[PDB]
UniProtKB/Swiss-Prot annotation, chains A, B:
One Pfam entry name: Cytochrom_C_2
Subunit structure, as described in the record: Homodimer.
Natural source organism: Alcaligenes xylosoxydans xylosoxydans
Listed transmembrane segments: none
Lineage: Bacteria, Pseudomonadati, Pseudomonadota, Betaproteobacteria, Burkholderiales
Localization, UniProt: Periplasm
Keyword Iron: yes
Keywords (A to Z) from UniProt: Electron transport, Heme, Iron, Metal-binding, Periplasm, Pyrrolidone carboxylic acid, Transport
GO biological process: electron transport chain
Modification after translation, per record: Binds 1 heme c group covalently per subunit.
Full protein name: Cytochrome c'
Length: 125, 125
């Protein structure tokens, strides 16, 4: 869907920005600093899970650029591993949100965050 | 969800960028220059309809900035009108995609695009 590789970089960056907002805005709720409204969280996690699937298709062949490390493309198997692991962690967060369980939401949220950081430490400049 | 107003501007810009990609990438299919795979379009329109709901909440009070015209906030009723009209047009596009009907997809896609342009001509610098 990208006319030039830069278009793919801007796309991915925009997706990750939105993930990020939808992930991070739940921090105060996981920490108990904001109230827990199960329905509000369920609906937000449903936005996050749609968004969480989007960045990956925008690291296709020849879309080197941005703050992506080249290793994304020389170590493709490892990178697909780490995105699929992240997405699997999002499934667990969606299950927790769907159950309306603040303890399981907290644990799941931490799992997800560790998966963001694990990818970044290997693949983000 | 925004620590400062700039965070809201970057969010909205990122959302609109992603709408945009998910909208525009269907142009060749509406024009017949790429093949029509009903399932592929149905799934893409489902991403677009989630994305299409996101920018509006990031033009809250005091989030002036970006390429947003001030009229967004002095003419709030008009702006909510134009976003709700746009979203209603997205409903019609989702119905067309769900029906697997290329004629209705084409008409709906044009409706949607006119709603993007109508907002921009009033509210985007
Ligand atoms: C888990 C929820 C997250 C969160 C909150 C973010 N990411 Fe990542 N990310 C990855 C790479 C390769 C990039 C560089 C992309 C590029 O510049 O080309 C990034 C970038 C980001 C950003 C910055 C986006 C920007 O606006 O420029 C942010 C906000 C961000 N990430 C948040 C790689 C990955 C992963 C590899 C499998 C995974 C998993 C994540 N990121 C997860 C998350
Ligand atoms: C219909 C599908 C679309 C499409 C393809 C886009 N928009 Fe708009 N838009 C609106 C305003 C006020 C802004 C300025 C936002 C800001 O800078 O603060 C924009 C911006 C955009 C962009 C640029 C984003 C960027 O990366 O900076 C693009 C790509 C874009 N739009 C595409 C206002 C509206 C509407 C008001 C109700 C509606 C409807 C749309 N936009 C619709 C669409």
């Amino acid at each position: 869907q990208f006319a030039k590789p830069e278009d793919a970089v801007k796309y991915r960056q925009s997706a990750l920005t939105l993930m990020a907002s939808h992930f991070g805005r739940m921090t105060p709720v996981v920490k108990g600093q904001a109230p827990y409204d199960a329905a509000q969280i369920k609906a937000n996690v449903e936005v996050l899970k749609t968004l969480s699937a989007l960045p990956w298709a925008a690291f296709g062949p020849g879309t080197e650029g941005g703050d992506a490390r080249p290793e994304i493309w020389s170590d493709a198997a490892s990178f697909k591993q780490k995105q699929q692991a992240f997405q699997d962690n999002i499934v667990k967060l969606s299950a927790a949100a769907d159950a309306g369980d603040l303890d399981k939401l907290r644990a799941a949220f931490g799992d997800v965050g560790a998966s963001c950081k694990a990818c970044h430490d290997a693949y983000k400049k």
